[PDB]
Structure 1
Amino acid sequence: ISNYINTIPVEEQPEYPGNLELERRIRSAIRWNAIMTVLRASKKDLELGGHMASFQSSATIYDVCFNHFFRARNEQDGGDLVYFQGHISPGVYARAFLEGRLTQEQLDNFRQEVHGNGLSSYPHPKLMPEFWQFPTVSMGLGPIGAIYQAKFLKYLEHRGLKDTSKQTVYAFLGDGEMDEPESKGAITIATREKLDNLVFVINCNLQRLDGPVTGNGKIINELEGIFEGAGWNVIKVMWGSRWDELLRKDTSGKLIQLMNETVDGDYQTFKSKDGAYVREHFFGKYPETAALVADWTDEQIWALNRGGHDPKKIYAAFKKAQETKGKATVILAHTIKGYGMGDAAMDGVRHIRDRFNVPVSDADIEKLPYITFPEGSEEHTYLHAQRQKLHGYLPSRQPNFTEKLELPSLQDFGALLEEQSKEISTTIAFVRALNVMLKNKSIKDRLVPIIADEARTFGMEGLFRQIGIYSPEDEKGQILQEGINELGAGCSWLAAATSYSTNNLPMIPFYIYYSMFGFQRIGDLCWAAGDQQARGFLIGGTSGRTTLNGEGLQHEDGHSHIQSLTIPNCISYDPAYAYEVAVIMHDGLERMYGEKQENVYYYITTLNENYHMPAMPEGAEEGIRKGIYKLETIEGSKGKVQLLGSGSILRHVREAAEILAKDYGVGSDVYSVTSFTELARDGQDCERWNMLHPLETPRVPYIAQVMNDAPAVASTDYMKLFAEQVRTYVPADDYRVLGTDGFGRSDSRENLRHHFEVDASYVVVAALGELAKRGEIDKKVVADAIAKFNIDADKVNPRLA
């Protein structure tokens, strides 16, 4: 930790290249429009919300960047990737409006998007696909997302895929936000990877929402200490130009002592007093310091500002940041929250108008008018000139990539569609599918396999010799090894999954990890990924409650699909066979990176259990994609039922079908459900449409088109709701669901499948139970089956176990 003063002394401060007076005129108009937008919204009295205080404290920081640093998307690259702090969006909108990129009607529709011509509260690409790029409002995700975005850009350059050398990633953060574990939890990574293309800009106004970050301390010093300790280049922008003479004249060095010893709480109090209170309680602490401003008027003392408000001090920091190599830079900008709002936190409106000399007359002020700069005016000319010299305007977004990829055909995965000689798993199938992709000339180098330390567990080792591990193991390595860091891996996956838009360079990531540590552990990022229109694959390996049998409670995943189904644009599958994996992966590739360019990403749970992999039935392709297809029909004269299974449990439902036929003469239709969720969604869509078109013939859910009315039983390696979600659409009077509800525990797969009541014996008992209630068989038959199969009818419900 250094002294509580600017890192860059004035004698090392470069000359400011812009027109300070003109830029201030433009900046005031932006401040005004940002405030007008939020105020007009509040007048509606519709609890729309919107902030003003934050942007007022960081406006000048962004202004200097827009005028002298921010590089817009261009022919060579996607320009600088700016992770704008979420709630300062009104300021971004105000500037875009001034630049003529947004209309007054859009500003007037701030926070009213449903009808189409509005603006999102925060940066949401999904809602404004041509404007916003990075979802930052969920605090903490922006800083780590930015770290890996910068790492990914280095990756593209090192891989020889794209020269991203002129791109800088800017993460605009709040000091309170730095408390989120993900904000500083991965900063050492920037040092390990020498991310000199990453700049953290922490707005240090010393306050969070309901108070100071650390009133009894100094968060700027806390931030400096840990970032410095993490190997980052720390640049503190503490005081404005007005303090320079005072510091120079301070021979006793007592002023510096005073600045260092004062805590955030005290500074904040001076922040709400007056020049007299300052010279009295601040400078008046020591005669050396008190004498420094003795010949100063209370108004000249109150004029002393914080560095984050001085364009000159700001410029120096960003210039130094862009020159620095070998490590990432973090700029700690000292600002005043709610700057220039005085009474804040119609007289208030008049105050800001006067405060920033806004060109609005008393006659118009009541109209809460937006300010514009006429073409030909000095402001208009300068505003556009600076941007033009920096390649255009930002933020802006390209929804689709331009190049045409020559994707592998399903036939290219032919081997996976055939019966397998050796017993393998769906994870082995996944790896083989990847290998097929690594042979496709058009996308082989666009593939981005990602692992979180463990590769052997998922049989990814074979890939190492083929494409290697990115380790700028060398700079050309293709696989991203992020270590024990699922969130970090997810962020690399996200950067890769959205490269098609950000860099107009489609990259196809495949991140495989323990399924449990997916949505459950990085769920907020997965939701943000949907918002960011990510197109890639998330592979939940070692999935299924009973399948990762020895690991127990915190590893056995029987619910990730319940978490994944909450994301609108995530398509989830739980294949049982190798050929399904192939079909699903091929379809995903085509949908996301083929002509369609569908904005959706995939989640495929794979297994670590080997078993016989049969050949794909002819014509089953569509059913596999849709989510269900009839595997086969087993004859039986004493009864008829339908059996459904997915994942590792399907082969057990198949065993039950054979038992039912052989021991009870009960026939059955056996279905492989590759996706209960896609089926549920299709069903909901049909019912929704039917409800809205009462005069039309009811549409039929696909699952209802595949199934019949015979009593049905479904068993999965997931909690019952996973299969129960399609109940409404199953055309059968009876539909019993077996599932793995309850906490996992360590044991053999056989013991766990009996414990969770999902194995063959339970499926059989469930099936016989339905046939009994229909009179087709006597109840003693099921009671005898229960005894026969060593089933404990009175063991505690697994959910409670």
Structure 2
Amino acid sequence: ISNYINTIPVEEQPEYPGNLELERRIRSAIRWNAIMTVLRASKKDLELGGHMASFQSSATIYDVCFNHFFRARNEQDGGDLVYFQGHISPGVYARAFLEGRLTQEQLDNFRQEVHGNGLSSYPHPKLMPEFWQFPTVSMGLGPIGAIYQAKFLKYLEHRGLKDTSKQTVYAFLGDGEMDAPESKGAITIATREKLDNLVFVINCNLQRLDGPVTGNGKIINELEGIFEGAGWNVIKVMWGSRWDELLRKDTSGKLIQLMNETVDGDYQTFKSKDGAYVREHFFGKYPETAALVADWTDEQIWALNRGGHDPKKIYAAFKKAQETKGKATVILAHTIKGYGMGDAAMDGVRHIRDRFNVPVSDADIEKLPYITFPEGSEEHTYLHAQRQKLHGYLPSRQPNFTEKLELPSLQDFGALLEEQSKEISTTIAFVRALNVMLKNKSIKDRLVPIIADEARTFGMEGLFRQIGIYSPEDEKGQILQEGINELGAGCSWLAAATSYSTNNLPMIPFYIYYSMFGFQRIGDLCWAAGDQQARGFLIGGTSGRTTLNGEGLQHEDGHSHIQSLTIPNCISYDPAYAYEVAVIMHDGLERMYGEKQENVYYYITTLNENYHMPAMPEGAEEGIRKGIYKLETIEGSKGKVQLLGSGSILRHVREAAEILAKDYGVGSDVYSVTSFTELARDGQDCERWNMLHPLETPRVPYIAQVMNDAPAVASTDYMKLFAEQVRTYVPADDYRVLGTDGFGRSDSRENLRHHFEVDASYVVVAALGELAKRGEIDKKVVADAIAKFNIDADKVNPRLA
């Protein structure tokens, strides 16, 4: 680390280009409206919430940026991409209001958006589709999301898809937020990728929410040390302009020594006392430092401020960051939390009114009025002139992309709809589907294949020589290889899946990884992706509890689908055949990037197990998209059942169908369930609608339009709940579900499918059991089947194993 002073000395500091006095009047009005918005919300006494102290500490930092740096979306590019610190939203709304982009009625509806004309608590594009762009309130995601957004912008330029050289990514972070592993865990990537189009602005007010970040330490030195060691350009903005005289005349170096040795805890104590106290405990530590302010009054000493509140020091930092190349820059802005709010941090708000010279009658304070600048006023003119120079207003968002893509038709995937020559897997099918898309002139170069180190495990080796690996294996490479870093790969996926909005340049990402390390490991990011309206594909490879048989407990995924169904705009599928993978990918491509432009993303689990891939049944396309279709009906005069399967288990369910017919004379209807989740949601929607329209023609759940009423059995490679979720909509009185509940373990696929009780043997027993209960066959038959199949009726429940 370096001395606890500004990185940029006054001598190298550029002249401030703006009208400081005018900007302060405008800024004071914004601080005011921000506070009023939150206080009005508090007055309603509805537990609405909202913060004020945070924006107060960073208001000047943002003000300098809005006046001289942030470029808004324009005809050439999406402008600067600003990841606003989540809880300072009231400050963004206040400025928007003054710019005339929001009404008073909207500020009055802060945190009350159910009725349509309110404002979200935090930046949520899903709720405010034309205003916010990036979800940042979940601490940690913003910084890593920003790093990969910056890398993605360079990717677009290097690929020759769009000149993004005029765009900068700004990430506004708190110092307490930096403790989240995601916040610093990927800062080395910025150095590897030379992201000089990235700027981290860390508001260092030395405090978390409940207390100091490191009371007996110096968080600023800690941050400087690690970012410096990571190869970043660190710019510290420590002290305001009043300190310049002091640091300049102290030829003893004692003041610096004092600033260096004083810890975060003591600095916080000062900002709760007064001038006299600072003179005694701070400057009074050494005779040399005591002499520097001897001729100063207590008031003059109390005026000394931290750098993050001085427009001149702030400007210098951002300007230098804008000139730095070959690496990312992080600005450490020293501020005071609860700035100008007094001890606090009706009438008690007249303190801030006087502190910031707010032009509001001390008679109207009770009314908590909003301040506005009339058209023609000096303030109004200035406010708009500075923004026009920067191409308009920010934040803003375009919900749809403008261009028309010529997507491939289902027929282009024709080869995958036919019976396959060799035994392949759904993952191999996925790769072949990707190849078809890579032949489409319209979207071939808009495709963004993303992988988490493991590429050989997914047979992606072929695409390598074909489209190359992005490596600024060169700068024209198309595939993003992020190594052992699912969160990083996920953030790359997110930047690509939202490029249609951010840069009005639709890109179509396909991120394939070990399904177990999907939602379970980066679920918080998947939730934010939905909020950000991500349109892309998440491919969970090596999925299924019993399919990735040798890997064991931390790799065998039998629940990612349970996690994915919790995300509203995520459409999940678990196909068993190659032709289903084709119809699904094609449909998803059409829904998200076709004229419909549906705001959803897809999650498709694929397998690493090879088996026979039959041809798609004529007319099954729509059923595949809806979640279920009938594969075949097998004759049998001793009984009749329904058998459902998905993923790798479907082949075993079909095996059971044959066993039931040839050994027991039991006939059956076999169905391939491509999506239990979409069928469950369709059913929930139908039942909701019918309940609200009791007098009208009821809607029938899709699954009830496919299945009949004979006893049913379902088996999958996931936990029982995956198939049980449609119980309510299944038109049969008997519905037994087999699943892989329990921790995985290492063994052969055969042994695991027997252990998890989902193989053909268990399907037969479950089906016979249902028939026996209906008196259609003797219970002894079921008991003998259990014996014949060597089933241990008394082994421990797999869930407890």
Compute the displacement of 1:308 (Å): 0.2
- Write the distance in 1 (CA, Å) between the matches of 2:647 and 2:70: 49
- Write the distance in 2 (CA, Å) between the matches of 1:385 and 1:149: 29
Compute the displacement of 1:698 (Å): 1.8
Compute the displacement of 1:242 (Å): 0.3
- Write the distance in 1 (CA, Å) between the matches of 2:344 and 2:586: 57
* 2:639 and 2:771 in contact (8 A); partners too: yes
Aligned-partner SS, 1:203:
strand
Aligned to 1:383: 383
Aligned to 2:231: 231
Aligned-partner SS, 1:362:
coil
* 1:84 and 1:136 in contact (8 A); partners too: yes
Write out per-residue CA displacement over residues 516-556 of structure 1, whole angstroms, 9 at most, x where no aligned residue: 00000000000000000000000000000000000000000
Aligned-partner SS, 1:331:
strand
Aligned-partner SS, 1:291:
helix
Aligned-partner SS, 1:510:
strand
Compute the displacement of 1:699 (Å): 1.0
- The TM-score with structure 2 as length reference comes to 1.00
- Write the distance in 1 (CA, Å) between the matches of 2:554 and 2:332: 39
Unpaired stretches in structure 2, ≥5 consecutive residues? none
Aligned to 1:132: 132
* 1:52 and 1:338 in contact (8 A); partners too: yes
Aligned to 1:161: 161
- Write the distance in 1 (CA, Å) between the matches of 2:37 and 2:764: 64
- Write the distance in 1 (CA, Å) between the matches of 2:72 and 2:466: 37
* 2:429 and 2:581 in contact (8 A); partners too: yes
Aligned-partner SS, 2:423:
coil
Compute the displacement of 1:347 (Å): 3.6
Compute the displacement of 1:359 (Å): 1.0
- Write the distance in 2 (CA, Å) between the matches of 1:669 and 1:461: 40
Write out per-residue CA displacement over residues 342-388 of structure 1, whole angstroms, 9 at most, x where no aligned residue: 03223421111111001111222111001100000000000000000
Count of residue pairs the alignment pairs up: 801
Aligned-partner SS, 1:49:
coil
Aligned-partner SS, 1:636:
coil
Aligned to 2:76: 76
Identity rate of aligned residues, in percent?
Answer: 100
Write out per-residue CA displacement over residues 103-128 of structure 1, whole angstroms, 9 at most, x where no aligned residue: 00000000000000000000000000
* 2:30 and 2:95 in contact (8 A); partners too: yes
- Write the distance in 2 (CA, Å) between the matches of 1:312 and 1:629: 68
Aligned-partner SS, 2:349:
helix
- Write the distance in 1 (CA, Å) between the matches of 2:84 and 2:505: 22
* 2:272 and 2:343 in contact (8 A); partners too: no
Aligned-partner SS, 1:366:
helix
Compute the displacement of 1:625 (Å): 0.2
Aligned-partner SS, 2:363:
helix
* 1:591 and 1:597 in contact (8 A); partners too: yes
* 2:470 and 2:479 in contact (8 A); partners too: yes
- Write the distance in 2 (CA, Å) between the matches of 1:474 and 1:98: 47
Write out per-residue CA displacement over residues 632-662 of structure 1, whole angstroms, 9 at most, x where no aligned residue: 0000000000000000000000000000000
* 2:347 and 2:365 in contact (8 A); partners too: no
* 1:110 and 1:120 in contact (8 A); partners too: yes
Compute the displacement of 1:303 (Å): 0.1
Greater CA drift, 364-373 or 594-603: 364-373
Aligned-partner SS, 1:387:
helix
* 1:194 and 1:328 in contact (8 A); partners too: yes
Unpaired stretches in structure 1, ≥5 consecutive residues? none
- Write the distance in 2 (CA, Å) between the matches of 1:209 and 1:313: 26
Write out per-residue CA displacement over residues 467-490 of structure 1, whole angstroms, 9 at most, x where no aligned residue: 000000110000000010000000
Aligned-partner SS, 1:302:
helix
Aligned-partner SS, 1:363:
coil
* 1:341 and 1:348 in contact (8 A); partners too: no
The root-mean-square deviation of aligned C-alpha atoms, in Å, is 0.4
Compute the displacement of 1:135 (Å): 0.1
- Write the distance in 2 (CA, Å) between the matches of 1:650 and 1:452: 28
* 2:626 and 2:675 in contact (8 A); partners too: yes
Compute the displacement of 1:697 (Å): 2.3
- Write the distance in 1 (CA, Å) between the matches of 2:113 and 2:254: 55
Aligned-partner SS, 2:171:
strand
Write out per-residue CA displacement over residues 650-681 of structure 1, whole angstroms, 9 at most, x where no aligned residue: 00000000000000000000000000000000
Aligned-partner SS, 1:736:
strand
* 2:446 and 2:508 in contact (8 A); partners too: yes
* 1:31 and 1:91 in contact (8 A); partners too: yes
* 1:143 and 1:182 in contact (8 A); partners too: yes
Aligned to 2:319: 319
- Write the distance in 1 (CA, Å) between the matches of 2:365 and 2:175: 34
- Write the distance in 1 (CA, Å) between the matches of 2:402 and 2:2: 49
Aligned to 1:530: 530
Compute the displacement of 1:284 (Å): 0.3
Aligned-partner SS, 1:344:
coil
Aligned-partner SS, 2:224:
helix
* 1:644 and 1:670 in contact (8 A); partners too: yes
- Write the distance in 2 (CA, Å) between the matches of 1:689 and 1:660: 39
Write out per-residue CA displacement over residues 429-459 of structure 1, whole angstroms, 9 at most, x where no aligned residue: 0000000000000000000000011100000
- Write the distance in 2 (CA, Å) between the matches of 1:341 and 1:456: 58
Aligned-partner SS, 1:342:
coil
Greater CA drift, 291-300 or 342-351: 342-351
Write out per-residue CA displacement over residues 163-207 of structure 1, whole angstroms, 9 at most, x where no aligned residue: 000000000000000000000000000000000000000000000
* 2:242 and 2:304 in contact (8 A); partners too: yes
- The TM-score with structure 1 as length reference comes to 1.00
* 2:347 and 2:366 in contact (8 A); partners too: no
Aligned to 1:102: 102
- Write the distance in 1 (CA, Å) between the matches of 2:768 and 2:689: 36
